[PDB]
Design a protein around this nucleic acid. Structure first.
Ligand SMILES: [Mg+2]
Ligand SMILES: [Mg+2]
Ligand SMILES: [Mg+2]
Ligand SMILES: [Mg+2]
Ligand SMILES: [Mg+2]
Ligand SMILES: [Mg+2]
Ligand SMILES: [Mg+2]
Ligand SMILES: [Mg+2]
Ligand SMILES: [Mg+2]
Ligand SMILES: [Mg+2]
Ligand SMILES: [Mg+2]
Ligand SMILES: [Mg+2]
Ligand SMILES: [Mg+2]
Ligand SMILES: [Mg+2]
Lengths: 98, 100, 127, 80, 206, 151
RNA sequence: AAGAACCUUACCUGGUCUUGACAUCCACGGAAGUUUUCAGAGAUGAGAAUGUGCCUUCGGGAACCGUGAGACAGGUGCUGCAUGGCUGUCGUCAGCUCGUGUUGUGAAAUGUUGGGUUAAGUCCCGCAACGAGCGCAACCCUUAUCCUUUGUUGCCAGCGGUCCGGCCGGGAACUCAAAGGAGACUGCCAGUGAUAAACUGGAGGAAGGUGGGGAUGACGUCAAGUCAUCAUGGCCCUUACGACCAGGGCUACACACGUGCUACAAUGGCGCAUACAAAGAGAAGCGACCUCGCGAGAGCAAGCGGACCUCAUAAAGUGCGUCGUAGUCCGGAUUGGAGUCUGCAACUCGACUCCAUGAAGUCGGAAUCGCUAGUAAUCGUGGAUCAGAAUGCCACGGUGAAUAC
């Protein structure tokens, strides 16, 4: 009944947060759906390499945005109390929709 | 880049949020099919009385570290050269070299 | 009950179910004749079946997603050979002897910076 | 103003200036730096002077010149 | 000219990132700006503290700046009487509540930024660059390293024509991606012009 | 090339007759990489070739090809102030794929209305040993005799 | 230059300012902020009504202005032949060197040459050389197959209800999504080979000899390019070469060159009907639905910061009909009129739509360019820049060759 979707710039870091969230859900006792990997978004940029001419020589960059979703289904009164500020990770977005 | 030009951008920013976040009715509200008397003709005439600094039309959107007018990138806010100088060093998170 | 094969030719992934019975083929809730129309797209589907001469023995249920005309038609030829791979076992050597088992991994390649299309450079004039 | 939905355009400074002229009719040529303004039928018979970039040239108004913008009658670049 | 940033091609392979925070497309160009304004001040304020690397992260609207240095006592001082003075202005610069903690680099001669820092301070102080860059190669290697290469270019010694001189000792593989190579650069604004300094230090291969 | 010798690719047979020789013909005739219309012309001209003269459709093709295959062709080598064209026998694999190129190119200069009508007319001409394709084949043969003193 | 109508603009004309449009100081007096009027092309000039942020400074300091004087600010001004930093290039070519030893009086040489082999100083054997480093290869990304885990906003093999729309219960099998593993190593067999490196083939395999592509560019050359991204040594203007504003120019046209789009048609034009994609973007943003308008588009206006909402109907193709080789139902320039949308503002100088007109062009002299396989050719979609404005740039897929003696 509440969806937690996690966004990060590296897969290994996003796994650290999704691993505890099911553990906390397992600590609630049961009834976790399991993290599901949504499709990844990748923005590719192409900036020129020189301060001047030689336009034909460029550099291509890319930023990825890995995605997860756990889909908490049973909202215990102790689930809501315990699921605030327990991500233990910096640089990971959190979004909870009721 | 020529600090004179950098001062223009913030003078045009200051007069952009000052007026055209509130004085937008003349160009948006009084433009459509409504009372067609001189009040619309007043709206057209009164829109020029405001200083020349309109919201979109006079913002060059230059770089934040050098003020380079060209090669801008809206996402990072730097030019095409400072992005590679705020570099692959690691200043920009999650931005690596692409190979597909 | 059913036997299965995938097929993945050129960005078009199929899925084929082979049913013993008579000879009738339905693909993506349409008949074989009307879905393709191209004579090179309704025989390439048939090519694995005619080689083993079952043709009139198998009932096929098929769903194909993505790709184009010959990409999907080639993908089905792959899946059918993979479907035949499952519920008979001694048939591999003959089936592989005529292809149909190699995935044919040939995809469209990059555009590449500095190149006009994908490998074609722009016209180069010395002076 | 390049649409009937918006209406024909003239600058405020020019609009008030021409209003004073017709109040007393034809007078000394009117010097103006406006070239983006249409020509209204209220200033027929005047000799307004547009500025092409270096000098003010007097353009004589006529009934025929009533839909053309002011700058049309001042060649901005010279040639032969 | 024909070489890529060795610290940059290895951003996702072995070398880490110097900024680890997330932000959607709306809050990126201004998160980056506040990153640059913090880095600009901290380098200038800690000029003689031999600061190596500044890594900035922003957990939940709260900037956390971690400074790496080989002289931690200079930075914090007597029971942190100055680190708070640094924190009290980072929030001003960034607009968010900060927490600056310090990590000590116990190899001041084995860091790329520190080595390139020391041998450009020397040039500004007018020591002959052959003595400067022959020292750094030996001092790093006798302290334990599998390779080092130091490169100095510019108007060396007041010569009217620019020249590049590089000393490489040991084994420094640049094409091998997995190698753990530390690279950095600095400058020297001498009375004659500008002198550039680069240094590669190769320590591990995994 | 100069270093790597290599074989040839595998050609899928045509969907109406199952002959690789006509499978190459739809490939040679095709422009812009659209086999759909390329094969549409070939069978259309092949059908009207069978009814007009000769028997079958895959047989009237092979009879026509016999009158456009060149036995000997001239290759030119540069020696001095000019070049001498030295004749050399042509291997069979090149011979088939060369006659077909002559047939199509000569059938793109016909004055008929559509390519379907042109291709069949030239193919029928070949079996009757006339046309513009067999015109080229005789010329390539004639040049060999002229320069056979340079063999 | 990843996008000059004003802006950008660094240029020109004209109108103006000076410790200044931008920063740190000293003193004086004011909370700042708000509305509006007059003169002006505008900068500005002259105002008229409106106002209070911490106390132990409360009598002034800290935020914001006005003024003064002096320190100084400012320069897209000169030298890329004084420099850093960053690039092109020979060149993805297989080379460029060192320590010790030996030879030569010596510059130097040997190692690096020689027999094969390799894409490669790659590898083996010889040899006054023995070793080492920077290069090659490998480590990296993507793609080709399989296995394990999860099943929303993705999927539907088997079940029931169907307004046969995954639509609904429902399932974790299938395509797919993204995490982790298995796989390819001349691994196995025959032959050639100096019994060696390796080579030619054979089996299995999704993949066979670095499987396809990308990233990666050694010592150095051109005192190659950039003082206009930026910084910096000198030189110079400093009531000016600094700064502000309105208009114009960067779009000028007897001509010449380069890179491209459209064509010159019948393997095509037009009309009707209808299949199949991939990747990507979105908050002063993407904008369904319905109505209106011949159309660009206008109105109300859901949904979505997103595997669901929008962009977004893909096109070449297929089926039917007509045009029968004509400057033509090919071609679409040019021009007259009528409009829509951004935008203070569309004349100089925007895009697009409606009606009419219909130019050169009927396969292009010498000469010259690209391409070896999902390649050339051909057809469409997306993105960056961006209020508006690409036939360019960057990226995706569909159809898909000929030839290598
Ligand atoms: Mg997206
Ligand atoms: Mg603009
Ligand atoms: Mg393509
Ligand atoms: Mg490079
Ligand atoms: Mg130079
Ligand atoms: Mg030069
Ligand atoms: Mg120059
Ligand atoms: Mg030598
Ligand atoms: Mg080697
Ligand atoms: Mg390599
Ligand atoms: Mg101006
Ligand atoms: Mg220009
Ligand atoms: Mg003509
Ligand atoms: Mg645009």
């Amino acid at each position: 009944r509440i969806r937690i979707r996690l966004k990060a710039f590296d897969h290994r870091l996003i796994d650290q947060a999704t691993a505890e969230i099911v553990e906390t859900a397992k600590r609630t006792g049961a009834q976790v759906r399991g993290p599901i990997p949504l499709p990844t978004r990748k923005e590719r940029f192409t900036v020129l390499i020189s301060p001047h001419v030689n336009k034909d020589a460029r550099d291509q960059y890319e930023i990825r945005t890995h995605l997860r979703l756990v889909d908490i289904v049973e909202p215990t009164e102790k689930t809501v109390d315990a699921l605030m500020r327990l991500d233990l990770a910096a640089g990971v977005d959190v979004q909870i929709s009721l | 880049a020529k600090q004179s030009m950098k001062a223009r951008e913030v003078k045009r920013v200051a007069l952009a949020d000052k007026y055209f976040a509130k004085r937008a009715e003349l160009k948006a509200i009084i433009s459509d099919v409504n009372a067609s008397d001189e009040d619309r003709w007043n709206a057209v005439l009164k829109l020029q009385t405001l200083p020349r600094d309109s919201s979109p039309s006079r913002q060059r959107n230059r770089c934040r570290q050098t003020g380079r007018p060209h090669g801008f990138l809206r996402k990072f806010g730097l030019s095409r050269i400072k992005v590679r100088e705020a570099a692959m060093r690691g200043e920009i998170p999650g931005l690596k070299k692409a190979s597909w | 009950n059913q036997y299965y094969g995938t097929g993945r030719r050129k960005s078009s992934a199929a899925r084929v179910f082979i049913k013993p019975g008579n000879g009738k083929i339905v693909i993506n809730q349409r008949s074989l004749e009307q879905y393709f129309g191209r004579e090179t797209a309704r025989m390439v589907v048939r090519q694995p079946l005619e080689l083993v001469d079952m043709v009139e023995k198998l009932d096929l249920y098929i769903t194909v997603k993505g790709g184009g005309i010959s990409g999907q038609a080639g993908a089905i030829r792959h899946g059918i050979t993979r479907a035949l791979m499952e519920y008979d076992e001694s048939l591999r050597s003959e089936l592989r002897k005529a292809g149909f088992v190699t995935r044919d991994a040939r995809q469209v390649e990059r555009k590449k910076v500095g190149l006009r299309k994908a490998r074609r450079r722009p016209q180069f004039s010395k002076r | 103003m390049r649409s009937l939905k918006k209406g024909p355009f003239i600058d405020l400074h020019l609009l008030k200036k021409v209003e004073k002229a017709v109040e007393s009719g034809d007078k000394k040529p009117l010097r103006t730096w406006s070239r983006r303004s249409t020509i209204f039928p209220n200033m027929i018979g005047l000799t307004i002077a547009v500025h092409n970039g270096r000098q003010h040239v007097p353009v004589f108004v006529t009934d025929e010149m009533v839909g053309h913008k002011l700058g049309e009658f001042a060649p901005t670049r010279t040639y032969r | 000219g024909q070489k890529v940033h060795p610290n940059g091609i290895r951003l996702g392979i072995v070398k880490p990132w110097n900024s680890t925070w997330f932000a959607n497309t709306k809050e990126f160009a201004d998160n980056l700006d506040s990153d640059f304004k913090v880095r600009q001040y901290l380098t200038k304020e800690l000029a003689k503290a031999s600061v190596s690397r500044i890594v900035i992260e922003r957990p939940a609207k709260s900037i956390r700046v971690t400074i790496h240095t080989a002289r931690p006592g200079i930075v914090i001082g007597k029971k942190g009487e100055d680190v708070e003075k640094l924190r009290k202005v980072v929030a001003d610069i960034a607009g968010v509540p900060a927490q600056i903690n310090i990590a000590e680099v116990r190899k001041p001669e084995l860091d790329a930024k520190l080595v390139a820092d020391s041998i450009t301070s020397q040039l500004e102080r007018r020591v002959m660059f052959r003595r400067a860059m022959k020292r750094a190669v030996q001092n790093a290697m006798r302290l334990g390293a599998k390779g080092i290469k130091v490169e100095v270019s510019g108007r060396l010694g007041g010569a009217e024509i620019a020249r590049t001189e590089w000393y490489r000792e040991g084994r420094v593989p640049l094409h091998t991606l997995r190698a753990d190579i530390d690279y950095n650069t600095s400058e020297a604004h001498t009375t004659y012009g500008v002198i550039g300094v680069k240094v590669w230090i190769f320590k591990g291969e995994i | 090339p100069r270093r790597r010798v290599i074989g040839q690719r595998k050609i899928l047979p045509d969907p109406k007759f199952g002959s690789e020789l006509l499978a190459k013909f739809v490939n040679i005739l095709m422009v812009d990489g659209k086999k759909s219309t390329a094969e549409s012309i070939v069978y259309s001209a092949l059908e009207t070739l069978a009814q007009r003269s000769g028997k079958s459709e895959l047989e009237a093709f092979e009879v026509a090809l016999e009158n456009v295959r060149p036995t000997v062709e001239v290759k030119s080598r540069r020696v001095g102030g000019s070049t001498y064209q030295v004749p050399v026998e042509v291997r069979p694999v090149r011979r088939n794929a060369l006659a077909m190129r002559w047939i199509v190119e000569a059938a793109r200069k016909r004055g008929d209305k559509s390519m379907a009508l042109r291709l069949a007319n030239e193919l029928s001409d070949a079996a009757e040993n006339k046309g513009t394709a067999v015109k080229k084949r005789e010329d390539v043969h004639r040049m060999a005799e002229a320069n056979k003193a340079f063999a």
